[PDB]
């Protein structure tokens, strides 16, 4: 199981580099320079970087600062060839943004927070990104009077329709991917699941180039089924980009490793992204990004195992799902539970819904004690799936 | 806080008429005559009465029981007055839907599911009721590989459409809301929140005519904030019906009371529906319907009582609601925090992307630590709505 | 992957023999007879079978009726070499007991719920059952007011210390197992948890003969970590029986088959009670016993599937903790995480309180930074586990 | 609704003092001086004041240090009269502390974590604290193989009973309290709840000096009914210390004000603190110690104003518990619901299991349809309990 740059593995400048403070306690790890993470990440197996500007850029740096880090950065990725596929924005760390950046009741946050957005479109198009993302973790509240929600989603809409209209004005190959959180570090967030953020789009001006970024986590979080999520993203053709790492229930934001949560979800997320839908339709074609936070009790040989554990993670998981979906008996199961049966349109080529209630079998004479018979025989067609991901079979 | 018909306390027949049973018991209670809870309900001070067919008439029901059980009922309703706001479906009972009605795998048992649904917008058009209902209890899976979700999505979208199309057909005055639940029956339920909801609802033919139906306990099933919910509902105008009940956390359905379990949240949700956005928008005018069961514990004085209590608790709650935002301290303690501000456009009138990222004031000569200086006053604004909660102020 | 006799797999008769009736639907399935069950489950490879006193002798049942169907009972046992472990009684469907059974706040259906336990005892001595289970589904409330807290545990304590010297009197080789639930069917059910539990126990007169009856699915609908519960039940020398099954997720109990849930966690339960302890200590050598529901999805075909799924998942998970506890690589790994260390005592014999703070190299002249640098490397030991459990290694 | 200190409420200096850096963010307020701290809580009507080792003393304090510290410290509780009835060690917040304190792999970093606790007994002693806390925050693991779970109940009771047994040896008057915490900062914390902890403690050798700390949104955080829990603590005579505060479900520890959190169970919290059990039994009378943490949108004002705030509301729910448990129409309805005979014993005096099994109107003879009928009212009880709530009574 060795990755290749064909496979298409992003990380998070921020992942490998979280020096491990969280909210009792400070860094076990010291900071970690870009230049190194690049470097590291080609000798992995990675694919590309993605970073927010301040994980590169400090927030006071000085012009001559940012060019001289630019030109470190630059020169790492033309040694090593990897890609920047991503680059989002922080509107979380400086205090300034206590209240959220796009949603803040300040005016004038609210004002910073967008040129700040704008300045790092300008940089997301120079580095190559086709994905901009944005991640509201301040916009929300702990408290149902601190906020006016109708006011809270016009002026996210504002937000993101004015990054969007500039992309379109600039002329850059960016789409924008909305990454929706629940909660932390908010009491409640906005936009907190896929749905929510899905139906958001639809209310924006220029939502043709804005679209989802999922994180298994963050879905899970709420204890939602992760591979229903993306399903409904793939099927409103709005999958944009996707996190993956691992989750261990409903707690704080855990940043396990993918795989290191819930496996059999993991697994079903696997067959979803590689094998598609059993009755086809679109599949995903973007980076598989991690975004997870190595243990804060591991030294720095653990997070390049870290590291590298994602990737093994997902060629494991992939390789179980293709043996899976190939096994003949499992395709008989598959028929057995209709799950092909499920493709078929219900009604009849041009059979109106006058004609469907007029139709005394389908209705009147149906009888609806013996279809209740059917053995839909889910449980076995669970058992081989479990079977194929223990390597069982 | 007595209630009278204006006030528009709407409840369901399966509600005072849930007669215990539970996956761990059989019922405590004798079953309700409907003829019966009509006239109890109008003695309470209801508006209305909701059901869904089989709560009135059996699945078996012969042609002859149908006329009588709907004299008696038209009857009853004649007699005391009481409207009929809502009508709903039952593809969740019988054992024919054990994997949906709209979803089902089985292509036979989709078409039948269709058919009872077409059917019930007739009768729900005879019975003056303006929202049909479609809560898709049994669409979902306990296991991963059960399904094709994007076939799953298309399923319910054919089933859905066809039902609006036929509304459009017959120039019957309905409107389709959906109900959203997470979990139970089924271990993941598709459209599991608002946001699914009203995502979904965008990829509608006939999507014009089709809203939703949040519940209280529902959303807090998954751990969101009701209210948060229903005002994205409210802005994307899709607030067709609500749900009040009460949830005390994330587990099984309780279906408590309205106020019996998250009470702050009882308490916001009040103050949105009466009050609406502080800056203003749509509101809400529906029926407010009490989706509850009586606790099995409870004889049938209980069950009168919890029916009361459902309308005490909503009344007490509004009292509380209006005294709070015509608090003159609480209107000041608003325009500190903010609330006002965020209703304020972002950009200034025809200001363009590029004519912000320029302005120095907003971005380059902006002076982030001091503006993080603000004192938001979020906790003192919380503060004043509890006091205001427990009749303090 | 052939269960056999010493396996110790048991399967309790409600399991197999649950008919589908959630709160939403009646049942999908007939009946199952209880010779049948016998007769199915021993041919599949299990040891013993366990009930609940009405899952075999119905509430209403005439003495002469009791007597007919033990005497078919007992004969099939015979038939089939089947034994009976544990025995347990139906507390909670009747209505009766709608408030409880020992903690009902009606003082005749406490004495009527003690005297149903004391002639189920007698019965569970005549099976040979050496395991007796309490679970008090319906003690606990919905409404914080409606118990006084000190007096429910009086009388839980009342009612459980009643059973043990009753045990005790007759001399029957029998020790009681609590199996605690934090909610369903109550909001709240009192002992929540396995240390609720263990505490509790701790209070009795009799507790010698009292320990506990952990669930899988149950410490989850708490969000805990199963292995982590049992493993302080076991290291207190009170893990006297276990259920097993799946939960994906705190939602209501959803009683899945052992495996089809959260299957690391899985993983490592099997690896606690086959294996032990890395340094040694407790085993727990009871049966493994089932408390699962079959998928009302499924026909009877899925019902005897489900129950061969549960002694599969049990048998391979257990040849790859083996293959995992086996390897040298992990054997190293381990050694480097300090698994090991963490058995040596932190006080060399003899030392006392007051040696140690005196003691200069462990406080005062601490390298504190030294010791942080260790690399604890649980990554690397968590992706060697999961390669295990994926068969790859 | 002037606290006054025989009201008892004591405060944390990490809770006032805590200056806004939460995982996603730094600080948002400057550092307050514990003089400062001192000085503003005495005046706010505080009784005392708790305090972690570091709170105060920096890790990296020199002997002149602390001495300067401590004197200007022990001045200011002089000049006020603050009491410190409560000090607790911080062993989470150093990178060394990584893998815990006492039961942290590395047996060199338990034997330091050990003398820090020591150290800080005597500091306890030192200063009139009766209650010494432990919070084991770093206690546990991410991943189920990163532990011998045996291993860390062994290492976690030899660091308690050491420090236990040198408080025996040393006459101070200190007893030892247990912070149960379910997750955060560690995926699983062990003694994850009270239950946990409760159990625990009865394996101690010193046992007898050991209680517990119940912490309201550390409960909650497992879903847990915490009203349920001190009840079960209090029960046992184990309720030594408490931390009270505000969660609004499952998700990160958000430490709101109390009352801000779950209301009706504050209520009820209240209530059993204050009033007791309604059939009389144990009493706390320790102190009311607020355990929160003023929200980082919000500059010192509504740090006060966060402190006077907790105070309010328990003040408040106070009142209407007083109201709400003198009402007569109260006591009427808990007599119907059976609140005082739950308090009855089940047995007669002098009556045995076999004469109870042997009495014919308690099993044979027992009419249970009748029983059944009983309406117990809890709805009823319910709604009086929550008009009292909100004032309304
Ligand atoms: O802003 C993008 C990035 N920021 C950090 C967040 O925590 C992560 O979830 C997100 O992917
Ligand atoms: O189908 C509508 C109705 N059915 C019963 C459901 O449980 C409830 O949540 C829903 O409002
Ligand atoms: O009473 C024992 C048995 N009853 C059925 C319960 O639902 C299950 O949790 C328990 O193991
Ligand atoms: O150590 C005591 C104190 N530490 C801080 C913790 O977060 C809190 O839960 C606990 O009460
Ligand atoms: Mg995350
Ligand atoms: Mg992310
Ligand atoms: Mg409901
Ligand atoms: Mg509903
Ligand atoms: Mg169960
Ligand atoms: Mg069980
Ligand atoms: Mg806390
Ligand atoms: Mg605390």
């Known amino acids: 199981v060795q990755p290749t740059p064909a496979d298409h593995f992003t990380f998070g400048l921020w992942t490998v580099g979280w020096t491990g403070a969280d909210p009792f306690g400070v860094a076990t790890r010291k900071n970690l320079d870009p230049v190194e993470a690049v470097h590291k990440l080609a000798e992995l197996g990675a694919y590309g970087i993605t970073f927010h500007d301040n994980d590169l850029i400090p927030f006071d740096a000085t012009e001559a600062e940012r060019e001289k880090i630019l030109g470190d950065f ?47 479109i300008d940089l997301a198009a120079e580095m190559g990104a086709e994905t901009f993302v944005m991640w509201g973790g301040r916009e929300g509240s702990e408290y149902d009077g601190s906020k006016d929600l109708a006011a809270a989603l016009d002026r996210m809409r504002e937000g993101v329709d004015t990054a969007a209209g500039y992309i379109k004005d600039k002329g850059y190959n960016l789409r924008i991917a ?26 924006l001006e220029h939502g043709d180039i804005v679209g989802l970024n999922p994180e298994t986590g ?33 707690k704080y934001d ?33 980076p598989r990004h991690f975004d997870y936070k ?19 993670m997902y060629l494991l998981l992939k390789e179980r799902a293709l043996a899976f979906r190939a096994d003949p008996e499992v395709q008989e199961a598959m028929k057995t539970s209709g799950v092909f049966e499920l493709g078929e349109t219900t009604l009849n080529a041009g059979e109106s819904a006058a004609d469907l209630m007029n139709d005394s079998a389908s209705f009147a004479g149906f009888d609806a004690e013996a279809a209740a018979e059917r053995n839909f025989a889910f449980i076995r067609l669970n058992q081989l799936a479990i079977e194929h991901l223990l390597g069982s079979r």
Request: glycine letters at 12%; hydrophobic letters at 35%.
């Open 74 to 120: 630059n020169q790492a990725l033309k040694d090593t060839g990897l890609k920047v596929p991503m680059v989002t924005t922080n509107l979380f760390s400086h205090p300034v943004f206590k209240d959220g950046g796009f949603t803040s009741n300040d005016r004038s946050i609210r004002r910073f927070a967008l040129a700040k957005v704008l300045h790092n």
């Open 218 to 250: 963050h879905e899970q979080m709420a204890g939602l089924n992760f591979t229903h999520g993306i399903a409904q993203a793939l099927w409103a053709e709005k999958l944009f980009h996707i996190d993956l790492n691992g989750q261990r229930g409903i």
């Open 178 to 203: 909305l990454e929706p959180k629940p909660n932390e570090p908010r009491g409640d967030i906005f936009l907190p699941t896929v749905g929510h953020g899905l139906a958001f789009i639809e209310q």
């Open 294 to 312: 190595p243990s804060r009790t591991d030294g720095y040989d653990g997070v390049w195992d870290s590291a590298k554990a994602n990737m093994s």
């Open 254 to 286: 855990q940043d396990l490793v993918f795989g290191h949560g819930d496996l059999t979800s993991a697994f079903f997320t696997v067959d979803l992204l590689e094998n598609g839908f059993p009755n086809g339709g679109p599949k995903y074609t973007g």
